[PDB]
């Protein structure tokens, strides 16, 4: 669906002589909190030796974009599950929000790489402060000063089956 970002903080169950186990936080992109918690347990078991049965979720909070009406460039570092192994991929996405950039990235992985949400891992989404660190041409072409472009061949949606006039594509 449309993505939200959550911080999920969990821990092992306290035992005898071991109070206050270490708290682990993870940033998860998901459609809702049930999916977010599921992905968190998946990664915690994949990385450490912690199971959902032996642990608990301490906190889960939605994280909002700080400046959702500011256009930013994002470097996205991902890796996808494969027979040859984990494969790094770096992409650049221009958008106003991290969740919008991640939604674009998932749609793009489905379109080009034929990849699914369960197969894609997000390693890091970072905002590029300076425009000189942008290094993909399909993003750098939109960083030109006084950028103006037209939209040739305008196709207007018709509400009726028949039109009494030949259409125009002018804009």
């Amino acid at each position: 669906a449309h993505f939200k970002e959550y911080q999920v903080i969990g821990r092992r169950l306290p035992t005898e002589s071991v109070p206050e186990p270490k708290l682990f936080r993870m940033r998860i992109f998901a459609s809702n909190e049930v999916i977010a918690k599921s992905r968190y347990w998946y990664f915690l078991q994949k990385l450490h030796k912690v199971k959902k049965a032996s642990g608990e979720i301490v906190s889960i909070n939605q994280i909002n974009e700080a400046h959702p009406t500011k256009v930013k460039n994002f470097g996205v570092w991902v890796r996808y599950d494969s027979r040859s192994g984990t494969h790094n991929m770096y992409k650049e996405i221009r958008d106003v929000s991290r969740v919008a950039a991640v939604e674009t990235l998932y749609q793009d992985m489905a379109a080009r790489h034929r990849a699914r949400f369960r197969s894609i891992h997000i390693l890091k989404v970072a905002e590029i402060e300076k425009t000189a660190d942008v290094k993909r041409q399909y993003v750098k072409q939109f960083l030109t000063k006084d950028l103006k472009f037209p939209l040739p061949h305008r196709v207007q949606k018709s509400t009726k089956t028949f039109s009494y006039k030949r259409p125009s594509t002018f804009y």
């Binding site: 911080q7 903080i9 936080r25 940033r27 909070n61 994280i63």
Partner: protein, 51 residues
């Protein structure tokens, strides 16, 4: 002879629950809470904003 849903029939609702009259009169379905000025800790804010 005929089952009447108390969620739609007010007489049946009042027959089953005498407190529904008090609830409607006091507007307890729209009760306002007292406001407090409790502030979260800076450690919570830093952990929430942390990457």
């Amino acid at each position: 002879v005929l089952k009447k849903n108390p969620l739609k029939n007010k007489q049946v609702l009042l027959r089953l629950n005498p407190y529904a009259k008090v609830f409607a009169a006091e507007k307890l379905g729209s009760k306002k809470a007292e406001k407090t000025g409790t502030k979260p800790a800076a450690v919570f804010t830093e952990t929430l904003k942390h990457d």
